[PDB]
Amino acid sequence: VAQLTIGNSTITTQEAANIIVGYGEWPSYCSDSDATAVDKPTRPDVSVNRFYTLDTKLWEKSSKGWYWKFPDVLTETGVFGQNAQFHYLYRSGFCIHVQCNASKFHQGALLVAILPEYVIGTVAGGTGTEDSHPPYKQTQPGADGFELQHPYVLDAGIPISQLTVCPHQWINLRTNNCATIIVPYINALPFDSALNHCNFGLLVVPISPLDYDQGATPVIPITITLAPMCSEFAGLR
């Protein structure tokens, strides 16, 4: 046991298990050239660099899986929510940390992954005749995430059977629980909007269904804690 403390926050997470650094790159600030050359972007090191602990989601024998959209997820709660709202341009890396409190008498496996530009696609009506672009609920599901309706096709006709081709980490209950992923800023632009375009999505699906002999707490809590690595903003409003 060893509790990391970076900010007015103090998560009592494991000493130092294995963390998957995304696409093999630590999120950093910027050389000296961007979508702003006579506009030196202030780099929030203040309260924009602490631990955020999203409202734990409950895993049932039936959860289809969940997903969050960055940077949206936090533009809500937080002083990082203060920045993302009062600023025009934005660039920031991350570091998610998904924990699972369960007993040795439970069992399951969660695939946790980061998928850049995660574009959803609802039923398209019901059978497939309605160009209805998903609600403002599926495009930016705040800090409480959103559930997958068709886990198999990740809600975008792509097979989850191949999701591991993204920065991912497994969470097999009989072997661990906490899993970590350091995401670097991935975009086709140095500085992009932090309110309309969501640089990516964090998925967390039960590949091996949760289960327990009858009599154990049936819902295992999944606690997602994240830390904004190298925030950057330009021009306030």
Binding site: A35, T36, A37, V38, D39, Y88, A234, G235, L236
Partner: protein, 143 residues
């Protein structure tokens, strides 16, 4: 009206820092403060003078310096669009310069109780232009 503007019309997209200058042409005896303020893309024109000041602004005093220059950080007309049919790369990045009366206009008996301010723009060194577009409504006509 600016040469800058007219040239841009001969180009499809661009980006850089700008530089508006303001020249007070009033009497010499005239004094007072005007508050020039720029509001980057998004944040609508400040409600009142107060709130406007809480963001990048410059209090200009003609009693002292008779000509102040404001720098627009960066404007990028690259965010593509498609209006009625003229799918031209629409700015989107419309900053917003507002000038406010910080103090009332002050003049002694004997001076013009109203003056004018000329504005001079131009892009900064780091300006670019990409893609040519011969859009010109003023065309050559056979006698």
């Amino acid at each position: 009206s600016t040469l800058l503007g007219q040239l841009c019309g001969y180009y499809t997209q661009w980006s850089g820092s700008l530089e508006v200058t303001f020249m007070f042409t009033g009497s010499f005896m005239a004094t007072g403060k005007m508050l020039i303020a720029y509001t980057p893309p998004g944040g609508p024109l400040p409600k009142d003078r107060a709130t406007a000041m809480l963001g990048t602004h410059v209090i200009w005093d003609f009693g002292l310096q008779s000509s102040v220059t404001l720098v627009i950080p960066w404007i990028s007309n690259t965010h593509y669009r498609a209006h009625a049919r003229d799918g031209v790369f629409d700015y989107y990045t419309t900053g917003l310069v507002s000038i406010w009366y910080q103090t009332n206009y002050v003049v002694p008996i004997g001076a013009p109780n109203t003056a004018y301010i000329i504005a001079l723009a131009a892009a900064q060194k780091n300006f670019t232009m990409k893609l040519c577009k011969d859009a010109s409504d003023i065309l050559q006509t056979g006698t």
